[PDB]
Ligand binder design. Sequence first.
Ligand SMILES: Cn1cnc2c(-c3cnc(Nc4ccc(N5CCOCC5)cc4)c(C(N)=O)n3)cccc21
Length: 287
Amino acid sequence: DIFNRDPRDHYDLLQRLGGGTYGEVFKARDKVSGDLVALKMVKMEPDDDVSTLQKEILILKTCRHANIVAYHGSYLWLQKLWICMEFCGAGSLQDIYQVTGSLSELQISYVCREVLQGLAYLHSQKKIHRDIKGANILINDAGEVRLADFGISAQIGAELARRLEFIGTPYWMAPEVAAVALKGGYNELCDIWSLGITAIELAELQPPLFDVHPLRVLFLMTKSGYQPPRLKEKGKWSAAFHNFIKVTLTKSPKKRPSATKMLSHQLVSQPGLNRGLILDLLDKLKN
Ligand SMILES: Cn1cnc2c(-c3cnc(Nc4ccc(N5CCOCC5)cc4)c(C(N)=O)n3)cccc21
């Protein structure tokens, strides 16, 4: 399950794909088969013991869904944990929309249906993703949509920095999460709000209030009179898209619909939503 060797023994490391609080991701090629993979490297600390690593690796290996990037294996070498996973050729939806411009309503509908399928699985497994945003939803060359990981709980190494990162960038978090370090707590329905913000992000190239200082956003979003965000151009979008934003962005978590409930919403249960819509989007990259 966890190899005691340098990942360089089995893989040719190619370009750095990106990074963040979750670690550094590299594109790699299997030396024998020639197949491409992604390797995420995380620096281990004196508290990351192998018993805890073993426990978290078994969860990484058993949490499997078609809409979540598949785990392939792992290596622990010179205080660095490397996680081998499926390679998503087109990168994240953020990498895509920062070239193509805004996604169409149908493209957003398909992405939301695919993400809701992933979230419904994670929630049935008593997990909360807590990291839904365009940069964390990956696309392969076939137009398939996959969550980069199962969220903040998939983090082995530097978990606290990743868990607290939203405080400096809270734009995608539900009001109940933004009320950090207060009595409230939250549940899996915070993921539904984050999916609603993400649908705005794909339509507008940034989440609502992205230009506002993160500490002012935390302050406003948790005020009693906070009005949940809306799409900026009423006319460009249909009544179904406006309603999907209205219900996913319900301020009270006790009134917000579940991932399974959202899967029957008119926007995501409509005919013709398939990977072909994202193949059309990836063709825009060529020009
Ligand atoms: C939280 N979080 C966010 N991202 C991840 C990832 C992660 C990140 N990037 C990936 N690939 C990738 C990135 C960029 C591009 N370019 C294409 C051409 O335009 C420029 C961008 C291509 C592929 C992959 C993967 N599996 O392939 N995974 C892994 C783990 C956690 C994560």
